[PDB]
mmCIF file of C-alpha atoms in Angstrom:
data_model
loop_
_atom_site.group_PDB
_atom_site.id
_atom_site.type_symbol
_atom_site.label_atom_id
_atom_site.label_comp_id
_atom_site.label_asym_id
_atom_site.label_seq_id
_atom_site.Cartn_x
_atom_site.Cartn_y
_atom_site.Cartn_z
ATOM 1 C CA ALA A 2 -50.226 -14.430 -0.945
ATOM 2 C CA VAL A 3 -49.290 -11.654 -3.423
ATOM 3 C CA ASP A 4 -46.307 -9.797 -1.990
ATOM 4 C CA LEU A 5 -46.026 -6.008 -2.360
ATOM 5 C CA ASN A 6 -42.893 -5.166 -4.442
ATOM 6 C CA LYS A 7 -41.733 -2.418 -2.095
ATOM 7 C CA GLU A 8 -38.032 -3.271 -1.584
ATOM 8 C CA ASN A 9 -35.664 -0.343 -1.971
ATOM 9 C CA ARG A 10 -38.387 2.240 -2.741
ATOM 10 C CA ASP A 11 -38.963 5.539 -0.966
ATOM 11 C CA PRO A 12 -41.468 4.842 1.868
ATOM 12 C CA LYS A 13 -43.460 7.985 1.154
ATOM 13 C CA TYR A 14 -43.878 6.804 -2.510
ATOM 14 C CA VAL A 15 -44.839 3.262 -1.377
ATOM 15 C CA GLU A 16 -47.437 4.680 0.996
ATOM 16 C CA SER A 17 -48.920 6.896 -1.714
ATOM 17 C CA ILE A 18 -49.340 3.865 -4.089
ATOM 18 C CA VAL A 19 -50.733 1.595 -1.345
ATOM 19 C CA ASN A 20 -53.363 4.185 -0.348
ATOM 20 C CA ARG A 21 -54.289 4.814 -4.046
ATOM 21 C CA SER A 22 -54.638 1.059 -4.664
ATOM 22 C CA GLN A 23 -56.649 0.572 -1.436
ATOM 23 C CA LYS A 24 -59.181 3.224 -2.490
ATOM 24 C CA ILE A 25 -59.787 1.405 -5.780
ATOM 25 C CA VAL A 26 -60.264 -1.918 -3.994
ATOM 26 C CA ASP A 27 -62.597 -0.358 -1.370
ATOM 27 C CA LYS A 28 -65.020 0.592 -4.162
ATOM 28 C CA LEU A 29 -65.315 -3.094 -5.142
ATOM 29 C CA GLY A 30 -66.847 -3.945 -1.730
ATOM 30 C CA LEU A 31 -65.182 -7.408 -1.663
ATOM 31 C CA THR A 32 -66.451 -9.625 1.178
ATOM 32 C CA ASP A 33 -63.206 -11.679 1.601
ATOM 33 C CA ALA A 34 -60.595 -9.467 3.354
ATOM 34 C CA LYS A 35 -57.610 -11.664 2.344
ATOM 35 C CA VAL A 36 -58.610 -11.576 -1.302
ATOM 36 C CA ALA A 37 -58.998 -7.762 -1.006
ATOM 37 C CA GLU A 38 -55.354 -7.568 0.255
ATOM 38 C CA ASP A 39 -54.082 -9.692 -2.629
ATOM 39 C CA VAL A 40 -56.012 -7.532 -5.167
ATOM 40 C CA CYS A 41 -54.627 -4.377 -3.542
ATOM 41 C CA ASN A 42 -51.057 -5.653 -3.956
ATOM 42 C CA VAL A 43 -51.534 -6.719 -7.631
ATOM 43 C CA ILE A 44 -52.737 -3.137 -8.325
ATOM 44 C CA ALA A 45 -49.930 -1.505 -6.321
ATOM 45 C CA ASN A 46 -47.335 -3.712 -8.088
ATOM 46 C CA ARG A 47 -48.617 -2.599 -11.548
ATOM 47 C CA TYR A 48 -48.181 1.082 -10.489
ATOM 48 C CA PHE A 49 -44.588 0.319 -9.459
ATOM 49 C CA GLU A 50 -43.886 -1.689 -12.631
ATOM 50 C CA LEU A 51 -45.107 1.244 -14.792
ATOM 51 C CA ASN A 52 -43.052 3.718 -12.708
ATOM 52 C CA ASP A 53 -39.893 1.653 -13.316
ATOM 53 C CA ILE A 54 -40.489 1.546 -17.065
ATOM 54 C CA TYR A 55 -40.940 5.348 -17.279
ATOM 55 C CA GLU A 56 -37.879 5.966 -15.064
ATOM 56 C CA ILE A 57 -35.756 4.080 -17.647
ATOM 57 C CA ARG A 58 -37.435 5.954 -20.508
ATOM 58 C CA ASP A 59 -36.762 9.344 -18.855
ATOM 59 C CA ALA A 60 -33.098 8.470 -18.083
ATOM 60 C CA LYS A 61 -32.503 7.467 -21.729
ATOM 61 C CA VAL A 62 -34.221 10.621 -23.058
ATOM 62 C CA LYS A 63 -32.208 12.890 -20.746
ATOM 63 C CA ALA A 64 -28.879 11.269 -21.812
ATOM 64 C CA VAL A 65 -29.775 11.697 -25.516
ATOM 65 C CA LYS A 66 -30.767 15.370 -24.957
ATOM 66 C CA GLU A 67 -27.548 16.011 -23.071
ATOM 67 C CA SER A 68 -25.344 14.221 -25.647
ATOM 68 C CA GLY A 69 -23.745 15.580 -28.862
ATOM 69 C CA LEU A 70 -26.330 14.053 -31.244
ATOM 70 C CA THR A 71 -28.116 16.701 -33.302
ATOM 71 C CA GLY A 72 -30.364 15.934 -36.248
ATOM 72 C CA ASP A 73 -32.005 12.695 -37.223
ATOM 73 C CA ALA A 74 -29.313 11.044 -35.116
ATOM 74 C CA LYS A 75 -30.866 12.780 -32.102
ATOM 75 C CA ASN A 76 -34.477 12.229 -33.098
ATOM 76 C CA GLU A 77 -34.019 8.566 -34.016
ATOM 77 C CA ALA A 78 -32.308 7.997 -30.645
ATOM 78 C CA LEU A 79 -35.348 9.605 -28.945
ATOM 79 C CA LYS A 80 -37.797 7.468 -30.965
ATOM 80 C CA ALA A 81 -35.787 4.350 -29.986
ATOM 81 C CA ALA A 82 -36.178 5.204 -26.243
ATOM 82 C CA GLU A 83 -39.952 5.578 -26.763
ATOM 83 C CA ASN A 84 -40.105 2.218 -28.676
ATOM 84 C CA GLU A 85 -38.231 0.476 -25.817
ATOM 85 C CA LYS A 86 -40.815 1.931 -23.404
ATOM 86 C CA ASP A 87 -43.783 0.777 -25.536
ATOM 87 C CA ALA A 88 -42.231 -2.722 -25.863
ATOM 88 C CA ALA A 89 -42.043 -2.965 -22.009
ATOM 89 C CA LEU A 90 -45.711 -1.875 -21.758
ATOM 90 C CA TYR A 91 -46.664 -4.486 -24.381
ATOM 91 C CA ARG A 92 -44.722 -7.309 -22.696
ATOM 92 C CA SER A 93 -46.337 -6.643 -19.250
ATOM 93 C CA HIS A 94 -49.877 -5.480 -20.294
ATOM 94 C CA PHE A 95 -51.631 -8.840 -20.406
ATOM 95 C CA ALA A 96 -50.062 -10.180 -17.160
ATOM 96 C CA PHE A 97 -52.072 -7.541 -15.122
ATOM 97 C CA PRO A 98 -55.596 -8.828 -15.895
ATOM 98 C CA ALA A 99 -54.239 -12.429 -15.760
ATOM 99 C CA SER A 100 -53.154 -11.732 -12.115
ATOM 100 C CA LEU A 101 -56.407 -9.943 -11.249
ATOM 101 C CA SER A 102 -58.445 -12.870 -12.751
ATOM 102 C CA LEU A 103 -57.097 -15.132 -9.988
ATOM 103 C CA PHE A 104 -59.319 -13.071 -7.625
ATOM 104 C CA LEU A 105 -61.855 -11.084 -9.632
ATOM 105 C CA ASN A 106 -64.611 -11.628 -12.243
ATOM 106 C CA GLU A 107 -64.664 -9.691 -15.561
ATOM 107 C CA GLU A 108 -66.932 -6.958 -14.200
ATOM 108 C CA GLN A 109 -64.632 -6.336 -11.223
ATOM 109 C CA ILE A 110 -61.533 -6.274 -13.525
ATOM 110 C CA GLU A 111 -63.323 -3.564 -15.550
ATOM 111 C CA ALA A 112 -64.078 -1.641 -12.284
ATOM 112 C CA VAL A 113 -60.319 -1.781 -11.486
ATOM 113 C CA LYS A 114 -59.439 -0.385 -14.964
ATOM 114 C CA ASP A 115 -61.998 2.410 -14.407
ATOM 115 C CA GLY A 116 -60.527 3.135 -10.955
ATOM 116 C CA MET A 117 -57.096 3.544 -12.457
ATOM 117 C CA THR A 118 -58.416 5.892 -15.214
ATOM 118 C CA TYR A 119 -60.643 8.053 -13.041
ATOM 119 C CA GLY A 120 -63.944 6.690 -14.496
ATOM 120 C CA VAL A 121 -63.414 8.791 -17.660
ATOM 121 C CA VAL A 122 -65.085 6.098 -19.890
ATOM 122 C CA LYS A 123 -68.497 6.445 -18.254
ATOM 123 C CA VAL A 124 -68.242 10.207 -17.780
ATOM 124 C CA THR A 125 -67.320 10.791 -21.437
ATOM 125 C CA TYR A 126 -69.900 8.346 -22.819
ATOM 126 C CA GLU A 127 -72.744 9.820 -20.809
ATOM 127 C CA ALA A 128 -71.724 13.409 -21.594
ATOM 128 C CA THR A 129 -71.589 12.628 -25.318
ATOM 129 C CA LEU A 130 -75.100 11.090 -25.262
ATOM 130 C CA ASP A 131 -76.370 14.090 -23.200
ATOM 131 C CA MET A 132 -74.991 16.577 -25.716
ATOM 132 C CA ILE A 133 -76.204 14.709 -28.817
ATOM 133 C CA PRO A 134 -79.547 13.007 -28.042
ATOM 134 C CA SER A 135 -80.087 12.165 -31.770
ATOM 135 C CA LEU A 136 -77.153 9.647 -32.021
ATOM 136 C CA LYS A 137 -77.746 6.458 -33.992
ATOM 137 C CA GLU A 138 -77.184 3.099 -32.335
ATOM 138 C CA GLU A 139 -74.214 2.327 -34.516
ATOM 139 C CA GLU A 140 -72.613 5.693 -33.523
ATOM 140 C CA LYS A 141 -73.041 4.978 -29.802
ATOM 141 C CA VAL A 142 -71.386 1.576 -30.302
ATOM 142 C CA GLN A 143 -68.416 3.100 -32.199
ATOM 143 C CA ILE A 144 -67.999 5.887 -29.620
ATOM 144 C CA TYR A 145 -68.067 3.387 -26.772
ATOM 145 C CA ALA A 146 -65.536 1.061 -28.565
ATOM 146 C CA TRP A 147 -62.985 3.891 -28.891
ATOM 147 C CA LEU A 148 -63.378 4.884 -25.226
ATOM 148 C CA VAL A 149 -62.703 1.222 -24.147
ATOM 149 C CA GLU A 150 -59.600 1.250 -26.403
ATOM 150 C CA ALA A 151 -58.487 4.575 -24.935
ATOM 151 C CA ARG A 152 -58.736 3.079 -21.435
ATOM 152 C CA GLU A 153 -56.312 0.231 -22.368
ATOM 153 C CA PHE A 154 -53.671 2.884 -23.163
ATOM 154 C CA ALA A 155 -54.556 5.313 -20.331
ATOM 155 C CA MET A 156 -54.254 2.574 -17.606
ATOM 156 C CA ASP A 157 -50.585 2.177 -18.786
ATOM 157 C CA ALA A 158 -49.830 5.960 -18.797
ATOM 158 C CA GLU A 159 -47.324 7.627 -16.488
ATOM 159 C CA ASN A 160 -49.553 9.957 -14.488
ATOM 160 C CA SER A 161 -52.922 11.773 -14.304
ATOM 161 C CA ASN A 162 -51.994 14.328 -16.949
ATOM 162 C CA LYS A 163 -50.923 11.709 -19.488
ATOM 163 C CA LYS A 164 -54.051 9.671 -18.736
ATOM 164 C CA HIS A 165 -56.305 12.669 -19.581
ATOM 165 C CA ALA A 166 -54.324 13.427 -22.698
ATOM 166 C CA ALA A 167 -54.668 9.763 -23.878
ATOM 167 C CA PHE A 168 -58.472 10.013 -23.528
ATOM 168 C CA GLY A 169 -58.165 13.443 -25.276
ATOM 169 C CA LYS A 170 -56.793 11.861 -28.418
ATOM 170 C CA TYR A 171 -59.699 9.367 -28.694
ATOM 171 C CA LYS A 172 -62.188 12.181 -27.882
ATOM 172 C CA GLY A 173 -60.698 14.046 -30.888
ATOM 173 C CA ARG A 174 -61.230 10.907 -32.957
ATOM 174 C CA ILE A 175 -64.849 10.774 -31.764
ATOM 175 C CA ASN A 176 -65.382 14.398 -32.858
ATOM 176 C CA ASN A 177 -63.871 13.868 -36.320
ATOM 177 C CA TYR A 178 -66.089 10.794 -36.781
ATOM 178 C CA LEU A 179 -69.272 12.656 -35.777
ATOM 179 C CA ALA A 180 -68.426 15.659 -38.019
ATOM 180 C CA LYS A 181 -67.731 13.275 -40.939
ATOM 181 C CA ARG A 182 -71.166 11.792 -40.307
ATOM 182 C CA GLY A 183 -72.828 15.206 -40.758
ATOM 183 C CA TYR A 184 -73.155 16.408 -37.145
ATOM 184 C CA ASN A 185 -72.504 20.151 -36.486
ATOM 185 C CA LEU A 186 -70.807 20.002 -33.112
ATOM 186 C CA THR A 187 -70.911 23.825 -32.529
ATOM 187 C CA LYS A 188 -74.675 23.733 -32.956
ATOM 188 C CA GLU A 189 -75.080 20.591 -30.843
ATOM 189 C CA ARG A 190 -73.251 22.342 -27.983
ATOM 190 C CA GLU A 191 -75.446 25.468 -28.287
ATOM 191 C CA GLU A 192 -78.634 23.421 -28.080
ATOM 192 C CA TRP A 193 -77.287 21.438 -25.153
ATOM 193 C CA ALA A 194 -76.554 24.687 -23.268
ATOM 194 C CA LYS A 195 -80.198 25.614 -23.847
ATOM 195 C CA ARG A 196 -81.386 22.165 -22.734
ATOM 196 C CA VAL A 197 -79.309 22.519 -19.563
ATOM 197 C CA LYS A 198 -81.019 25.848 -18.650
ATOM 198 C CA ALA A 199 -84.613 24.811 -19.549
ATOM 199 C CA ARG A 200 -83.870 21.635 -17.539
ATOM 200 C CA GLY A 201 -83.063 24.009 -14.610
ATOM 201 C CA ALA B 2 -68.828 -1.273 -44.926
ATOM 202 C CA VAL B 3 -65.330 -2.405 -43.832
ATOM 203 C CA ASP B 4 -63.090 -2.326 -46.895
ATOM 204 C CA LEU B 5 -60.454 -5.033 -47.435
ATOM 205 C CA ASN B 6 -56.955 -3.417 -47.423
ATOM 206 C CA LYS B 7 -55.772 -5.297 -50.501
ATOM 207 C CA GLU B 8 -54.249 -2.506 -52.642
ATOM 208 C CA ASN B 9 -50.828 -3.288 -54.062
ATOM 209 C CA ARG B 10 -50.575 -6.787 -52.521
ATOM 210 C CA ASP B 11 -49.849 -10.031 -54.344
ATOM 211 C CA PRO B 12 -53.252 -11.524 -55.333
ATOM 212 C CA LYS B 13 -52.238 -15.029 -54.314
ATOM 213 C CA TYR B 14 -51.354 -13.676 -50.796
ATOM 214 C CA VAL B 15 -54.649 -11.711 -50.600
ATOM 215 C CA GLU B 16 -56.607 -14.819 -51.551
ATOM 216 C CA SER B 17 -54.826 -16.924 -48.934
ATOM 217 C CA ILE B 18 -55.706 -14.375 -46.153
ATOM 218 C CA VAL B 19 -59.319 -13.960 -47.336
ATOM 219 C CA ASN B 20 -59.897 -17.740 -47.331
ATOM 220 C CA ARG B 21 -58.225 -18.092 -43.866
ATOM 221 C CA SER B 22 -60.383 -15.267 -42.465
ATOM 222 C CA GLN B 23 -63.553 -16.701 -44.077
ATOM 223 C CA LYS B 24 -62.996 -20.085 -42.406
ATOM 224 C CA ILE B 25 -62.801 -18.418 -38.988
ATOM 225 C CA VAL B 26 -65.995 -16.456 -39.629
ATOM 226 C CA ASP B 27 -67.830 -19.561 -40.952
ATOM 227 C CA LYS B 28 -67.350 -21.231 -37.554
ATOM 228 C CA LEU B 29 -69.251 -18.360 -35.888
ATOM 229 C CA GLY B 30 -72.436 -19.258 -37.828
ATOM 230 C CA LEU B 31 -73.517 -15.578 -38.077
ATOM 231 C CA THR B 32 -77.071 -15.149 -39.413
ATOM 232 C CA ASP B 33 -76.507 -11.683 -41.025
ATOM 233 C CA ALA B 34 -74.447 -12.164 -44.236
ATOM 234 C CA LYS B 35 -73.406 -8.473 -44.482
ATOM 235 C CA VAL B 36 -72.130 -8.459 -40.922
ATOM 236 C CA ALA B 37 -70.230 -11.712 -41.691
ATOM 237 C CA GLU B 38 -68.493 -9.912 -44.630
ATOM 238 C CA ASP B 39 -67.522 -6.956 -42.446
ATOM 239 C CA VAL B 40 -66.139 -9.319 -39.738
ATOM 240 C CA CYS B 41 -64.207 -11.244 -42.398
ATOM 241 C CA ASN B 42 -62.552 -8.031 -43.614
ATOM 242 C CA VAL B 43 -61.630 -6.800 -40.078
ATOM 243 C CA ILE B 44 -59.874 -10.177 -39.557
ATOM 244 C CA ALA B 45 -58.168 -10.136 -42.970
ATOM 245 C CA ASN B 46 -56.991 -6.531 -42.380
ATOM 246 C CA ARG B 47 -55.369 -7.518 -39.025
ATOM 247 C CA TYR B 48 -53.424 -10.316 -40.828
ATOM 248 C CA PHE B 49 -52.176 -7.759 -43.368
ATOM 249 C CA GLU B 50 -51.343 -5.181 -40.675
ATOM 250 C CA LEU B 51 -49.246 -7.790 -38.787
ATOM 251 C CA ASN B 52 -47.541 -8.869 -42.045
ATOM 252 C CA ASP B 53 -46.516 -5.254 -42.743
ATOM 253 C CA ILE B 54 -45.055 -4.826 -39.264
ATOM 254 C CA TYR B 55 -42.943 -8.012 -39.568
ATOM 255 C CA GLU B 56 -41.795 -7.070 -43.097
ATOM 256 C CA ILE B 57 -40.306 -3.845 -41.641
ATOM 257 C CA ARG B 58 -38.775 -5.773 -38.734
ATOM 258 C CA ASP B 59 -37.158 -8.315 -41.101
ATOM 259 C CA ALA B 60 -35.803 -5.580 -43.440
ATOM 260 C CA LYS B 61 -34.193 -3.760 -40.482
ATOM 261 C CA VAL B 62 -32.692 -6.994 -39.085
ATOM 262 C CA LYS B 63 -31.251 -7.983 -42.475
ATOM 263 C CA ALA B 64 -29.623 -4.524 -42.956
ATOM 264 C CA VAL B 65 -28.049 -4.700 -39.464
ATOM 265 C CA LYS B 66 -26.740 -8.256 -40.122
ATOM 266 C CA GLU B 67 -25.314 -7.175 -43.457
ATOM 267 C CA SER B 68 -23.721 -3.978 -42.066
ATOM 268 C CA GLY B 69 -20.289 -3.471 -40.421
ATOM 269 C CA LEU B 70 -21.604 -3.390 -36.822
ATOM 270 C CA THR B 71 -20.080 -6.135 -34.682
ATOM 271 C CA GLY B 72 -20.445 -6.337 -30.920
ATOM 272 C CA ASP B 73 -22.914 -4.622 -28.663
ATOM 273 C CA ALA B 74 -23.302 -2.117 -31.490
ATOM 274 C CA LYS B 75 -24.746 -4.964 -33.568
ATOM 275 C CA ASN B 76 -26.811 -6.517 -30.800
ATOM 276 C CA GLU B 77 -28.263 -3.222 -29.573
ATOM 277 C CA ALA B 78 -29.248 -2.384 -33.170
ATOM 278 C CA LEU B 79 -31.025 -5.778 -33.367
ATOM 279 C CA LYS B 80 -32.805 -5.209 -30.028
ATOM 280 C CA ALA B 81 -33.926 -1.761 -31.284
ATOM 281 C CA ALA B 82 -35.548 -3.362 -34.398
ATOM 282 C CA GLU B 83 -37.399 -5.820 -32.123
ATOM 283 C CA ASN B 84 -38.544 -2.942 -29.804
ATOM 284 C CA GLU B 85 -39.874 -0.998 -32.834
ATOM 285 C CA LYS B 86 -41.821 -4.133 -33.833
ATOM 286 C CA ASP B 87 -43.276 -4.619 -30.320
ATOM 287 C CA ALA B 88 -44.250 -0.905 -30.174
ATOM 288 C CA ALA B 89 -46.227 -1.326 -33.469
ATOM 289 C CA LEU B 90 -47.973 -4.422 -32.031
ATOM 290 C CA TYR B 91 -48.805 -2.474 -28.850
ATOM 291 C CA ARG B 92 -50.149 0.572 -30.723
ATOM 292 C CA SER B 93 -52.491 -1.562 -32.934
ATOM 293 C CA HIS B 94 -53.459 -4.395 -30.482
ATOM 294 C CA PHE B 95 -56.506 -2.816 -28.872
ATOM 295 C CA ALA B 96 -57.980 -1.440 -32.148
ATOM 296 C CA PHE B 97 -58.670 -5.081 -33.343
ATOM 297 C CA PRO B 98 -61.236 -6.051 -30.670
ATOM 298 C CA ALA B 99 -62.626 -2.462 -30.795
ATOM 299 C CA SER B 100 -63.377 -3.036 -34.544
ATOM 300 C CA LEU B 101 -64.756 -6.542 -33.964
ATOM 301 C CA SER B 102 -67.018 -5.209 -31.120
ATOM 302 C CA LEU B 103 -68.938 -3.158 -33.705
ATOM 303 C CA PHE B 104 -70.270 -6.538 -34.958
ATOM 304 C CA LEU B 105 -69.635 -9.229 -32.358
ATOM 305 C CA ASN B 106 -70.350 -9.972 -28.664
ATOM 306 C CA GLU B 107 -67.543 -10.888 -26.206
ATOM 307 C CA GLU B 108 -67.994 -14.629 -26.717
ATOM 308 C CA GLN B 109 -67.701 -14.290 -30.504
ATOM 309 C CA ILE B 110 -64.580 -12.046 -30.143
ATOM 310 C CA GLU B 111 -63.038 -14.848 -28.041
ATOM 311 C CA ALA B 112 -64.002 -17.408 -30.771
ATOM 312 C CA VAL B 113 -62.160 -15.191 -33.317
ATOM 313 C CA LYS B 114 -59.018 -15.096 -31.093
ATOM 314 C CA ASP B 115 -59.208 -18.911 -30.793
ATOM 315 C CA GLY B 116 -59.605 -19.238 -34.580
ATOM 316 C CA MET B 117 -56.475 -17.214 -35.125
ATOM 317 C CA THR B 118 -54.489 -19.316 -32.576
ATOM 318 C CA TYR B 119 -55.670 -22.739 -33.685
ATOM 319 C CA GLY B 120 -57.799 -23.390 -30.536
ATOM 320 C CA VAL B 121 -54.609 -24.112 -28.533
ATOM 321 C CA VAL B 122 -56.134 -22.603 -25.305
ATOM 322 C CA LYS B 123 -58.867 -25.229 -25.024
ATOM 323 C CA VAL B 124 -56.690 -28.090 -26.257
ATOM 324 C CA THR B 125 -53.919 -27.304 -23.753
ATOM 325 C CA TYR B 126 -56.287 -26.694 -20.826
ATOM 326 C CA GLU B 127 -58.181 -29.924 -21.357
ATOM 327 C CA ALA B 128 -54.997 -31.955 -21.884
ATOM 328 C CA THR B 129 -53.500 -30.568 -18.669
ATOM 329 C CA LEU B 130 -56.628 -31.492 -16.654
ATOM 330 C CA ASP B 131 -56.656 -34.973 -18.311
ATOM 331 C CA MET B 132 -53.036 -35.607 -17.355
ATOM 332 C CA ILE B 133 -53.342 -34.302 -13.780
ATOM 333 C CA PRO B 134 -56.827 -35.131 -12.424
ATOM 334 C CA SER B 135 -55.783 -34.102 -8.853
ATOM 335 C CA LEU B 136 -55.349 -30.335 -9.653
ATOM 336 C CA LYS B 137 -56.636 -27.844 -7.096
ATOM 337 C CA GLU B 138 -59.142 -25.205 -8.146
ATOM 338 C CA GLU B 139 -56.663 -22.413 -7.665
ATOM 339 C CA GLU B 140 -54.152 -24.254 -9.942
ATOM 340 C CA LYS B 141 -56.727 -24.653 -12.726
ATOM 341 C CA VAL B 142 -57.491 -20.921 -12.503
ATOM 342 C CA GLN B 143 -53.777 -19.967 -12.692
ATOM 343 C CA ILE B 144 -53.149 -22.366 -15.598
ATOM 344 C CA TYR B 145 -56.132 -20.997 -17.493
ATOM 345 C CA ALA B 146 -55.054 -17.334 -16.827
ATOM 346 C CA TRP B 147 -51.608 -17.941 -18.372
ATOM 347 C CA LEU B 148 -53.108 -19.635 -21.447
ATOM 348 C CA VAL B 149 -55.434 -16.585 -22.010
ATOM 349 C CA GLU B 150 -52.355 -14.321 -21.684
ATOM 350 C CA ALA B 151 -50.410 -16.512 -24.106
ATOM 351 C CA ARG B 152 -53.232 -16.155 -26.648
ATOM 352 C CA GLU B 153 -52.969 -12.311 -26.553
ATOM 353 C CA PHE B 154 -49.337 -12.639 -27.715
ATOM 354 C CA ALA B 155 -49.859 -15.589 -30.109
ATOM 355 C CA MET B 156 -52.693 -13.789 -32.043
ATOM 356 C CA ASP B 157 -50.062 -11.056 -32.830
ATOM 357 C CA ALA B 158 -47.317 -13.541 -33.911
ATOM 358 C CA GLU B 159 -45.930 -13.766 -37.435
ATOM 359 C CA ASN B 160 -46.923 -17.291 -38.429
ATOM 360 C CA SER B 161 -48.014 -20.759 -37.222
ATOM 361 C CA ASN B 162 -44.568 -21.692 -35.941
ATOM 362 C CA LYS B 163 -44.192 -18.538 -33.853
ATOM 363 C CA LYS B 164 -47.735 -18.973 -32.524
ATOM 364 C CA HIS B 165 -46.905 -22.498 -31.235
ATOM 365 C CA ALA B 166 -43.647 -21.314 -29.753
ATOM 366 C CA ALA B 167 -45.463 -18.451 -27.899
ATOM 367 C CA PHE B 168 -47.847 -20.995 -26.318
ATOM 368 C CA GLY B 169 -44.714 -23.150 -25.643
ATOM 369 C CA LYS B 170 -43.225 -20.507 -23.394
ATOM 370 C CA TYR B 171 -46.384 -20.261 -21.225
ATOM 371 C CA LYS B 172 -46.647 -24.096 -21.178
ATOM 372 C CA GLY B 173 -43.084 -24.088 -19.749
ATOM 373 C CA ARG B 174 -44.254 -21.579 -17.149
ATOM 374 C CA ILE B 175 -47.178 -23.872 -16.299
ATOM 375 C CA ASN B 176 -44.780 -26.805 -15.788
ATOM 376 C CA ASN B 177 -42.412 -24.836 -13.536
ATOM 377 C CA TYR B 178 -45.399 -23.692 -11.451
ATOM 378 C CA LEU B 179 -46.761 -27.239 -11.037
ATOM 379 C CA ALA B 180 -43.300 -28.645 -10.139
ATOM 380 C CA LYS B 181 -42.825 -25.828 -7.584
ATOM 381 C CA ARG B 182 -46.164 -26.856 -6.102
ATOM 382 C CA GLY B 183 -44.916 -30.423 -5.523
ATOM 383 C CA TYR B 184 -46.223 -32.231 -8.625
ATOM 384 C CA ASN B 185 -43.905 -34.873 -10.211
ATOM 385 C CA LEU B 186 -44.649 -34.371 -13.882
ATOM 386 C CA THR B 187 -42.712 -37.515 -15.037
ATOM 387 C CA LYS B 188 -44.884 -39.623 -12.757
ATOM 388 C CA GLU B 189 -48.089 -37.820 -13.744
ATOM 389 C CA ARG B 190 -47.350 -38.618 -17.405
ATOM 390 C CA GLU B 191 -46.680 -42.310 -16.625
ATOM 391 C CA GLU B 192 -49.989 -42.672 -14.804
ATOM 392 C CA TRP B 193 -51.824 -40.870 -17.579
ATOM 393 C CA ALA B 194 -50.372 -43.308 -20.146
ATOM 394 C CA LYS B 195 -51.781 -46.108 -17.990
ATOM 395 C CA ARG B 196 -55.151 -44.349 -17.682
ATOM 396 C CA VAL B 197 -55.254 -43.972 -21.468
ATOM 397 C CA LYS B 198 -54.776 -47.758 -21.997
ATOM 398 C CA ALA B 199 -57.171 -48.941 -19.228
ATOM 399 C CA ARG B 200 -59.634 -46.402 -20.702
ATOM 400 C CA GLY B 201 -59.189 -48.312 -24.021
#
C-alpha cells in the first residue's frame, strides 16, 4: 500500500490535504477502490513534501531578514535560500509522476496535474482561442506548449496565489509573443466583447 | 527558424555538439528537412545551455576550494554552489520538451531523451528482465518507472560519465527493492550465466 505521511502533523492540516487529494481522485472515476486510495495518498504526500520544503525556505528567509546582513550580503543570502528551495523541488519533481505511473496511465497523470493547478491550462487555452479566432496553427501549438510548461512549475508552487501567479508569467509571455507577431491585443479584446454580446 | 546559439564559442566545441545533435535527429528519420534542422538546433542549444550552467558551477567550486574557508563554512559554500546549479537545471528543464513539442510528437521527444542518454533505459530494462524471468508485473512497472525518472536527471548531466553514474544510482535502488522483495540477486546472476551458455 502507499502510506500517508501524516506523522507529527496537525490533524486539521492533514484532513484538509486528504480531502483536497480525494476530490482530485474522485474526478478520475477509478473503478478499483484500493488503487484510488493509493493514488490519493501519493497526491497527499506530494502536498506534504512541498509544504516541508517551503517551511524550510521561509525559516531561512526570516532568519536572514532578522540578522545583521545588509547589502549584497543580505540579498545573496536570500538568493541562496531560494536556490536551496528550487534544488529540493528539482530533486523530488520526477518521483511524483513515477509514483503515480504505478497506478495511472498518462492521461490520468495529466488529469491529476490539472486537478492540482485548478484546470488553468484548459481554461486559458480555450479563452485565448475564443478571443483571437484568427490564430495560426503554429501559434496555437506555441501557446499550448508554454501553458504545459507553466503547469510543471505551478504544480510545485506553495499555494493557490503562487499557482495563479506562475500561470500569470507564462500568460505574459504569450501576450508578448502575439504582439511581436503583429496582433493588436487591445483591438482583439474589443472585438471579442462585441462577439460576446452579438452571441447573446 | 530556431537559431543555433553558437556566438563566442570555440568552433571545435560547436562542431562537436552539432554533429552529436545531428546523429540523434538522423535516428528519428524525419521527412521534413527544415523541421529536422530546427530540431537539431533545439538539441544543440540544450547541450550549450547545460555546459554554461556547469561552467559556472565549476568556477564557484574552484574559488571556494582555493579560498580560506575551512570547515562547515567551506562545505556549506560548496553545497550552495551545487544548489545554484540544480536551481538552473530546474528553471530550464521544462522549456526543452516545450521547444521540441513545436516539431515532434511524444514518441519522438522520448526518442530524443533516449538519444541523449545513450539508450540506457531500454538496455537496462531488457537486461533486468533477461536476468530475472520470474518478475511480477508490478515489479516490472516499478523498475521501469525508476529508469524513466533516472533519464530525466541523466539528460541534464554534465557528460557521459555523470550520465552513467546517474543511472547507476537508480540501478542500485532497483537492486535494493528486488532484494527487499525476497530475490537473491547472486543466485539470479548464476542462473542467468547458465541460461546464457545453454542458450548458446
